[PDB]
Amino acid sequence: DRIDSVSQLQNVAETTKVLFDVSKETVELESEAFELKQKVELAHEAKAVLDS
Amino acid sequence: VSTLIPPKVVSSKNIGSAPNAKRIANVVHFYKSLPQGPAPAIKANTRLARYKAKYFDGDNASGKPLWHFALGIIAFGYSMEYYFH
Amino acid sequence: LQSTLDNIQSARPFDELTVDDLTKIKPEIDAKVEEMVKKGKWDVPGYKDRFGNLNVM
């Protein structure tokens, strides 16, 4: 039974490193379009005033 | 708030689980155990070694030794009950 | 643990193991018998479950 328990995570821990790696960027890489959000909302009011 | 990391924390987790207590038990129970009936000491040589190999071994384990004991009394007819009380 | 499996498959003295060898393999087996007598736990349970008492009729 302990053969299976050890073999459950024989391949997991090293494959979780790239998992832990990429998950960090994919979470904390949302700032570039956050600034684009600032200019996208800047565009809407620019359209809004001229439409007004 | 961030990426949690409980995939790799068994280096200190493999001590408190119940199977680990059995794990450290039976592995010690295995290494020194004799492989294939080695060191059985089948050649018994102590005083009446011949008796140790015919009936005293236990393969027969029957009434022959008491039959031998009874015959010894029969052979002692003129030593205990005759010529004496 | 794989070596343990290879260890157990060809090292099974289920018919020729020595209890004194069990004393050698674990001093606890030796240790647990002395204080058993001194403390007064003369009766030993846990036998009739596996082997019957083998009472004559």
UniProtKB/Swiss-Prot annotation, chain A:
Intracellular or extracellular location(s): Mitochondrion; Mitochondrion inner membrane
Residues bearing the modification Phosphoserine: S5
Role of this protein: Mitochondrial membrane ATP synthase (F(1)F(0) ATP synthase or Complex V) produces ATP from ADP in the presence of a proton gradient across the membrane which is generated by electron transport complexes of the respiratory chain. F-type ATPases consist of two structural domains, F(1) - containing the extramembraneous catalytic core, and F(0) - containing the membrane proton channel, linked together by a central stalk and a peripheral stalk. During catalysis, ATP synthesis in the catalytic domain of F(1) is coupled via a rotary mechanism of the central stalk subunits to proton translocation.
Family that this chain belongs to: Belongs to the eukaryotic ATPase B chain family.
Other observations noted: Present with 12900 molecules/cell in log phase SD medium.
Subunit relationships: F-type ATPases have 2 components, CF(1) - the catalytic core - and CF(0) - the membrane proton channel. In yeast, the dimeric form of ATP synthase consists of 17 polypeptides: alpha, beta, gamma, delta, epsilon, 4 (B), 5 (OSCP), 6 (A), 8, 9 (C), d, E (Tim11), f, g, h, i/j and k.
Protein name (database record): ATP synthase subunit 4, mitochondrial
Gene that this polypeptide is encoded by: ATP4
Parent sequence residues shown: 140 to 191 of 244
From Swiss-Prot, chain B:
Main localisation: mitochondrion
Compartments in which it is found: Mitochondrion; Mitochondrion inner membrane
GO biological process, one term: proton motive force-driven ATP synthesis
GO cellular component: mitochondrial inner membrane; mitochondrion; proton-transporting ATP synthase complex
Keyword terms, alphabetized: ATP synthesis, CF(0), Hydrogen ion transport, Ion transport, Membrane, Mitochondrion, Mitochondrion inner membrane, Transit peptide, Transport
Source organism, top-level taxon: Eukaryota
TM region positions: none
Cited function: Mitochondrial membrane ATP synthase (F(1)F(0) ATP synthase or Complex V) produces ATP from ADP in the presence of a proton gradient across the membrane which is generated by electron transport complexes of the respiratory chain. F-type ATPases consist of two structural domains, F(1) - containing the extramembraneous catalytic core and F(0) - containing the membrane proton channel, linked together by a central stalk and a peripheral stalk. During catalysis, ATP synthesis in the catalytic domain of F(1) is coupled via a rotary mechanism of the central stalk subunits to proton translocation.
Subunit comment: F-type ATPases have 2 components, CF(1) - the catalytic core - and CF(0) - the membrane proton channel. In yeast, the dimeric form of ATP synthase consists of 17 polypeptides: alpha, beta, gamma, delta, epsilon, 4 (B), 5 (OSCP), 6 (A), 8, 9 (C), d, E (Tim11), f, g, h, i/j and k.
Family: Belongs to the ATPase F chain family.
Other known facts: Present with 14600 molecules/cell in log phase SD medium.
Protein name: ATP synthase subunit f, mitochondrial
Portion held of the full protein: 7 to 91 of 101
UniProtKB/Swiss-Prot annotation, chain C:
Entire protein: shown range: 118 to 174 of 174
Name of the molecule in the record: ATP synthase subunit d, mitochondrial
Chain's gene name: ATP7
Function in brief: Mitochondrial membrane ATP synthase (F(1)F(0) ATP synthase or Complex V) produces ATP from ADP in the presence of a proton gradient across the membrane which is generated by electron transport complexes of the respiratory chain. F-type ATPases consist of two structural domains, F(1) - containing the extramembraneous catalytic core, and F(0) - containing the membrane proton channel, linked together by a central stalk and a peripheral stalk. During catalysis, ATP synthesis in the catalytic domain of F(1) is coupled via a rotary mechanism of the central stalk subunits to proton translocation.
Localization terms from the record: Mitochondrion; Mitochondrion inner membrane
Miscellaneous: Present with 6820 molecules/cell in log phase SD medium.
Assembly mode: F-type ATPases have 2 components, CF(1) - the catalytic core - and CF(0) - the membrane proton channel. In yeast, the dimeric form of ATP synthase consists of 17 polypeptides: alpha, beta, gamma, delta, epsilon, 4 (B), 5 (OSCP), 6 (A), 8, 9 (C), d, E (Tim11), f, g, h, i/j and k.
Species assigned in the record: Saccharomyces cerevisiae (strain ATCC 204508 / S288c) (Baker's yeast)
Similarity comment: Belongs to the ATPase d subunit family.
